[PDB]
RNA sequence: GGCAGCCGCGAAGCUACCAUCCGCUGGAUUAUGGCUGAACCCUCUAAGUCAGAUCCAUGCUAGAAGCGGUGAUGCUCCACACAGAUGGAUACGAAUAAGGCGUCCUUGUGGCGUCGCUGAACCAUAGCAGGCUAGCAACGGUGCACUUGGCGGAAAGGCCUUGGGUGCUUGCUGGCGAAUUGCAAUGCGUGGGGAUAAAUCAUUUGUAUACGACUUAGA
RNA sequence: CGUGGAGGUCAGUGACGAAGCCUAGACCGUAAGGUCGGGUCGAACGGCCUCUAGUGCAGAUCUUGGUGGUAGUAGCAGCGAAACCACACCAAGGGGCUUGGCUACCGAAGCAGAAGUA
RNA sequence: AGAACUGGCGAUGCGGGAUGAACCGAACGUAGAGUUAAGGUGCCGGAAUACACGCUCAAGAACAAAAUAG
RNA sequence: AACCAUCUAGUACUGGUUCCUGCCGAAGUUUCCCUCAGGAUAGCAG
């Protein structure tokens, strides 16, 4: 429906994440995924730290969490194929939100939450944390620059909530007429 | 195999925010090896106030000038090179750098630039906003005057040079002020200071630290070579000049151990990218003799004012 | 004192522990040492939490047969030629055992009302694949080219925006034509010349050398 | 189904082109194969009922003849082979299909002093 | 060790089981529509990130076994 | 100590055994000639 979907990865799982948006661009559909630093692993920081170096123990490997979650990705789509190949060409990652993706609506996957899958109490384990534990060296800056990009965002936000109080008030007053009356009766 | 003739700054110490704005490295050419003799005045040593002999090497560092600046933005992927900004002139060797054919070549070097730096300075005082605002990391673009040291290299070496100074502000004003100036190497480095070493051997590139400057050569004033004690009207270039090597007419320092590289060979120095606490680095290098004999053959002579000494007359 | 000969001394050289110079500093953690504190008074453990070596960072070597900036000119004539838009990717942040929106004073972790229980939402959406054209109501909405100011460095290259120009306006009232397609077949550079910015070879250079490669310079 | 030859029949086909060969052409049949479209070719061949057999090849470390990698290599600017030739870097599961990748610090110990983790 | 009684395969495709000769279904003319078996329904892979009750923080998806409700 | 031309295309287990299609289509055993050698018998399929 979308040409392009920018997805937030912040509060998501990353195998739901990750399982959601390879069935949903093998399918042709544009993904784009924002602040995958932010993106939650299921469990305390030990078991997570774990089962990497497990791997890692074997090629070449990647620290940025934008690599990690390609990694779960590409394991979910069929590479070495041309479709495979293909699909994997409709995907981009990068940690926080860089331009032009920070000035476009970004969207979320109810069904990866990590509120709405793990049960309250748990611990839960952050892709930044783990990135920079291996070896991660941008995690200062990513949180820096994303700090910043809040930064005027707010004001951009409160400039608009100024300009649809305008739009309301003058809703309201032209309210309650005829015309009002009839768009009201057709639902509208 | 090394990627050229000369070697990469592959880091940087510390910025310092208090600190005024100064350079951080210096390059030049190796010159050959000397011996030297200092009271060795370390204390808690068996050899306290002896007589140590050891030897030091010597490097050519002629002037170095700035010929632009460069800044460099803090993104997620590495730092970015925002924006080079030359300054108005090129030295002929430092054009000649730009060429592989440079006598077949038309020698067209920059010319617009040129006269773009001949406009109002706008785009120039434009950019140098731009670089305030903007990223807060620079680092200076310098070249070697080749042209006064004694080789047929005659190609001057690039080279960059990041500042340390604080309020990158007054870094960018620094630049904007002392563009196409002259650096000396006593404004970079000073005796008893410690610095690292960087070059390539007879072919791969490696780094030494903890390196203490037994010397800073002024080339300008004669008895460079001598020291408080011996204080004799000699220059540390021996009789007959050089093994492999022109001659020593400027500025030079003198480095404790071999830095690596043959004689000719480009190297750098840097200010041992943090502050060494030991006392070995505190303590200062008073000097007694330097060698001066002539290194080509087995000289019995120290300068030809004493030579004929031993033989008192010849033909 | 010839030369296919020997002797005393011998620079230059490959080279030596056979000599010389140098050869790391910040964090999270096993065990461990402790605080607060339940299951169950206590307790380092259940939720929190300080110190602490294996790990990660610093430095060092190379740089994807990955990426950024900068300088030089591609300028001209002749001859030929060509993985899936078709409504809008509609922008705060943070939590999920709390959040927004409006108001005011008690300006604070404030009181009240209001909303979620999905995007089933907002824009716009009428005119031959969207024409011609006569009026009414306002001084608005907006396409295109201008102009003013700021802003966006993370991959900014995009955001508005002062002012005027020219079109539409379906906001409202009417006229002119649709036919026959006949009942649907979705309905963009070369290959040859004129000048020239630059590279490789010839020469040389040696700080390079099994051959490539690398390092210098002569209009 | 197909071939060498023979009896019979097509008062058969054919220099206005028979056989063979080629053909990113087509038709027929489940197939052995037959037929037609186009190019070289030149003089014999075929539709059908029977008889006849030295009658149909993918190999037999098969025979003759011909040609490649090895290799412009070993070797003796030039000359120039031989052996061999089903085919071509690794992790796990399974002989070379499945899934993928180049001594220090702590605790006990009449341990006065001296002097378990890794 | 020695046998032996009936059976699966000898010459056996096809679907599932990461692959397999001892497993499960099922044994075979050429195709269409439709309904199923074992096997599955987060992606590779076609299908419910179905519904309902509890369990577990660590794997979990015959051998080192003996020490939250009643 | 050999070589040449015939008897000798000898003395049996290694290897190979050439076009298409359709139908049917088992066995690895009884037990008698006791047995290594195999014949005749018995079963399956015509």
């Known amino acids: ?188 | 195999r090394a990627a050229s003739i000369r070697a990469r700054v592959k880091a940087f110490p510390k910025d310092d925010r208090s600190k005024p704005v100064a350079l951080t490295s210096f390059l030049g050419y190796k010159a050959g090896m000397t011996t030297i003799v200092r009271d060795l005045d370390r204390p808690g040593s068996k050899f306290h106030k002896r007589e140590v002999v050891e030897a030091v090497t010597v490097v050519d560092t002629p002037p170095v000038v700035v010929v632009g600046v460069v800044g460099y933005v803090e993104t997620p992927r590495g730092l970015r090179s925002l924006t080079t900004v030359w300054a108005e002139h090129l030295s002929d060797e430092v054009k000649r750098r730009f060429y592989k054919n440079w006598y077949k070549s038309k020698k067209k070097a920059f010319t617009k630039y040129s006269a773009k730096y001949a406009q109002d300075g706008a785009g120039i005082e434009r950019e140098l906003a731009r670089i305030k605002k903007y990223a807060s990391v620079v680092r200076v673009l310098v070249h070697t005057q080749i042209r006064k040291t004694p080789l047929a290299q005659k190609k001057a070496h690039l080279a960059e040079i990041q500042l340390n100074g604080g309020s990158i502000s007054e870094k960018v004003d620094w630049a904007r002020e002392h563009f196409e100036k002259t650096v000396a190497v006593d404004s970079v480095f000073e005796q008893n200071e410690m610095i690292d070493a960087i070059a390539v051997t007879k072919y791969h590139s490696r780094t030494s630290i903890n390196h203490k400057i037994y010397r800073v050569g002024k080339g300008d004033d004669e008895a460079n070579g001598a020291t408080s004690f011996d204080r004799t009207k000699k220059t540390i270039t021996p009789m007959g000049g050089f093994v492999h090597y022109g001659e020593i007419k400027n500025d030079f320092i003198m480095v404790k151990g071999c830095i690596p590289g043959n004689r000719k060979r480009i190297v750098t120095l840097r200010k041992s990218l943090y502050t060494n606490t030991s006392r070995k680095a505190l303590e200062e290098v008073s000097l007694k003799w330097i060698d001066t004999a002539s290194k080509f053959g087995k000289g019995r002579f120290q300068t030809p004012a004493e030579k004929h000494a031993f033989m008192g007359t010849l033909k």
């Open chain 1, 1 to 188: 429906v979308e040409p392009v979907v920018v997805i937030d990865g912040k509060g998501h799982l990353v195998g739901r994440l990750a399982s959601v948006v390879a069935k949903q661009l093998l399918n042709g559909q544009k993904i784009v995924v924002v602040r995958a630093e932010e993106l939650n692993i299921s469990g305390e920081f030990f078991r997570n730290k774990l089962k990497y170096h497990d791997f890692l123990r074997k090629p070449f490997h990647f620290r940025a969490p934008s690599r990690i979650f390609y990694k779960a990705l590409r394991g979910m789509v069929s590479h070495k194929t041309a479709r495979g190949k293909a699909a994997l060409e409709r995907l981009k990652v990068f940690e926080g939100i860089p331009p032009p993706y920070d000035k476009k609506k970004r969207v979320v996957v109810p069904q990866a939450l990590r509120v709405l899958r793990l049960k309250p109490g748990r611990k839960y384990t952050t892709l930044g944390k783990l990135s920079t534990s291996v070896g991660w060296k941008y995690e200062d800056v990513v949180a820096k620059l994303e700090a910043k990009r809040k930064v005027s965002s707010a004001e951009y936000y409160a400039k608009k909530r100024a300009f649809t109080k305008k739009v309301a008030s003058a809703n309201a007053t032209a309210a309650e007429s005829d015309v009002a009356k009839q768009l009201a009766a057709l639902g509208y």
